[PDB]
């Protein structure tokens, strides 16, 4: 019906047809078949320490670390966040120091605002954690040095003022260094009742549709309780 | 980058008496002491004890199910006077040691 048991092709008839056509548009367009090419396929190596990566890749890893910290969402003490932000700023600082074209004056608006928000977040975290960690002002000073390296006087002066004020604040701080009532009333009433004087749970079984069934104790008058109390084998067991 | 591939053609063939053992103590310290003593007990030549369930409660239904269902000889140890709540009946081939 569908498959042939005979596996030999006989001679005669069996004139198959071959038809070939071609369009110039196919040859001109050539469509596209670039799935994976040598240009887009490259080796990949991994380094544990973040100083091995170049400053750009160091920042590309620092942003992921910041995302992980945000996923943690603990907030509260932010010394680790301050260190991450300081490393992020050090990426720009070493970019400028090494000799890259990146200079704060030459930076475009997006990169300028990114630098500003990074240094602002670092300074905010350092100011928050200055009292908890005595060395947070060190990261504040390092951020101010990074701003000076980038040659941004506007943020540099603010960083210097905030770090001086943080040092002063740290120095000064270190130099300084119904339900219950209802339950109580009920307990008192119960204790008074007990002093003056000087119910039982019933097992429940969820049978069907999670409907409870209560097995209440059998009435004391029926014969079944005495039937259970009587010995099983009179000849063998003691009476 | 490859792990060992199991082969199901090999099967276990019993050479010794396989004693399936369940242990249940009255208290957690009793359970720890019983486990330590059991593991300090050396293995005999023709005896192999397999410890399935160790607990702090009394005899349950799942204990009887684990020990008596398989034809292998079974021992259930009850350290202390823990109250039992098993509704089934323990098979005769299974030794219950209440101590």
């Amino acid at each position: 019906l569908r498959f042939a048991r005979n596996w030999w092709l006989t001679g005669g008839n069996n004139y198959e047809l071959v038809h070939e056509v071609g369009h110039e548009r196919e040859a001109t367009e050539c469509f596209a078949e670039y799935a994976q090419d040598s240009s887009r396929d490259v080796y990949l190596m991994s380094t544990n320490r973040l100083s091995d990566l170049p400053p750009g890749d160091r920042l590309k890893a620092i942003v992921g670390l910041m995302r992980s910290r945000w996923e943690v969402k603990d907030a509260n003490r932010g010394y680790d966040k301050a260190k991450l932000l300081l490393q992020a700023l050090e990426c720009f600082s070493e970019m400028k120091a090494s000799g890259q074209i990146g200079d704060f004056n030459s930076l475009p608006e997006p990169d300028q605002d990114t630098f500003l928000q990074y240094v602002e977040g670092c300074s905010r975290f350092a100011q928050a954690c200055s009292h908890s960690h005595p060395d947070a002002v060190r990261v504040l000073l390092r951020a101010a040095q990074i701003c000076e390296e980038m040659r941004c006087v506007e943020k540099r002066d603010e960083m210097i003022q905030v770090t001086e004020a943080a040092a002063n604040r740290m120095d000064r701080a270190y130099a300084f260094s119904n339900e219950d009532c209802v339950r109580l009333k009920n307990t008192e009433e119960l204790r008074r009742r007990f002093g003056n004087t000087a119910p039982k749970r019933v097992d429940c079984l969820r049978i069907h549709r999670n409907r409870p069934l209560l097995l209440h104790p059998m009435k004391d008058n029926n014969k079944l309780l005495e039937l259970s109390k009587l010995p099983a084998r009179p000849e063998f067991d003691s009476w | 980058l490859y792990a060992r591939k199991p082969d199901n053609n090999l099967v276990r063939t019993y050479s010794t008496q396989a004693f399936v053992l369940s242990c249940k103590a009255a208290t957690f310290g009793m359970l720890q002491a019983l486990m330590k003593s059991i593991y300090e007990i050396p293995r005999l030549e023709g005896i192999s004890t397999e410890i399935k369930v160790t607990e702090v409660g009394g005899l349950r239904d799942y204990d009887v199910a684990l020990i008596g269902s398989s034809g292998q000889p079974g021992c259930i140890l009850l350290y202390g006077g823990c109250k039992d709540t098993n509704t089934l009946d323990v098979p005769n081939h299974v030794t219950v040691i209440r101590f």
């Binding site: 080796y43 991994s46 544990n48 | -």
Partner: protein, 51 residues
């Protein structure tokens, strides 16, 4: 080849990081134990003197 070398190098780096973390934990444990021993020695000599 690229996939094999990537996987192997990542595994090596991760194993090194884990071993370094365990070494740091062991050093922390040893320092805490040393502090405990120092405190215990002071307490023992104080106990003898007070007795």
């Amino acid at each position: 080849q690229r996939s094999y070398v990537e996987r192997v190098h990542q595994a090596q780096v991760r194993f090194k990081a884990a071993m370094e973390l365990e070494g740091q934990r062991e050093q922390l444990i040893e320092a805490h134990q040393a502090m405990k021993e120092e405190r215990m020695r002071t307490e023992r000599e104080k106990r003898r003197q007070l007795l």
